[PDB]
C-alpha cells in the first residue's frame, strides 16, 4: 500500500 515504483 502507498508504494512507489518509478
Q: What does it look like?
A:
0% of the residues lie in helices and 0% in strands. It contains no helices and no strands. It is mostly loops. The chain is rod-shaped. The PDB classes it as protein fibril. The entry lists the keywords amyloid, MicroED, prion, yeast, New1p, protein fibril.
Structural class assignment? little secondary structure
Number of strands: 0
Helicity, as a percent range: under 10%
The helix count comes to 0
Which outline best applies? rod-shaped
Distance between the termini: 15 Å
Please summarize the sheet with the most strands.
none
Strand content: under 5%
Computed Rg: 5 Å
PDB class: protein fibril
Keywords: amyloid, MicroED, prion, yeast, New1p, protein fibril
Assembly: monomeric
Entry title: MicroED structure of sequence variant of repeat segment of the yeast prion New1p phased by ARCIMBOLDO-BORGES
